[PDB]
Design a protein around this ligand. Sequence first.
Ligand code: OGA
Ligand code: MG
Ligand code: NI
Ligand code: ZN
Length: 331
Amino acid sequence: AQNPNCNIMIFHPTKEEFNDFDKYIAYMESQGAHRAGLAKIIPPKEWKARETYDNISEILIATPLQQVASGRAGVFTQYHKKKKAMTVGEYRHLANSKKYQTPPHQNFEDLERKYWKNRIYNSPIYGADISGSLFDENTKQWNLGHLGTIQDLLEKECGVVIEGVNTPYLYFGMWKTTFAWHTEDMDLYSINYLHLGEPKTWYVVPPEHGQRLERLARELFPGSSRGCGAFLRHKVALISPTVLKENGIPFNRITQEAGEFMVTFPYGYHAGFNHGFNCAEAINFATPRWIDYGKMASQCSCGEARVTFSMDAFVRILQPERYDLWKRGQD
Ligand SMILES: O=C(O)CNC(=O)C(=O)O
Ligand SMILES: [Mg+2]
Ligand code: NI
Ligand SMILES: [Zn+2]
């Protein structure tokens, strides 16, 4: 069995190996990358996403979200408070202000200590889930706006044509902006490209151990757990590496820098934070190996998780027994 300790693998494809996306994901899996739940892909030196980032300041962040925490330093939830619209240029200035800027630090490890110690006492502002792309239309390799769609993958594997579309999302982050413990909708893959700015630290639980994380989460968030049998779908719970180690949950950590891709694998629980002002782009995708994970994915039916139009057909076709109850939660 390849990668039996489920370590995060890092790949350095040549320009020739960067041509065929599907083939390269399948190569990574042949080496055991999926066992970690997360992999890093460093693009060939010849490659670029676009010529410059000099003209992005007029992008609108229509609903910036202030991430307010409750709980204790290592075990907390966050809720998103909606703020007034601002441009990327306005947001970058805010990120760099004395109230919100990255503190002085020695190295990534010192910054990670400061995050875990102090996150709860601040409420950073995140520009999340903004439909759009920063890839140049002429970038032919690993362009997240030109991937094969999940609807076409289900059609190719299963023979059923379905409605729905699949487009990327932009994330503008600042110091301490946080992504809570989750897997993707329908336990899909994701791919994330860090276009510019400061790093993003990730934590991940191997897919084979995901239920261990879920059991801990039910213990640590006992009211949430009673309200919904899949409450990590709400994307609001944080658990620190210290707490995970104290409870024996297997995980790994890695920092992504500007110009690097990360791939999350089906049922790979992940969480993390941004080091300072940055812009990432991400999208879900599928392969043939995903289908069995989609069929088994948990669902939130309490009404909190509320998701895209395109998840309907996935539930309808892969999980027909669940469909009725899940749609009640959507309406
Ligand atoms: O970058 C973020 O805030 C969160 N991204 C992801 O969870 C992802 O790409 O799967
Ligand atoms: Mg602009
Ligand atoms: Ni994710
Ligand atoms: Zn729920």
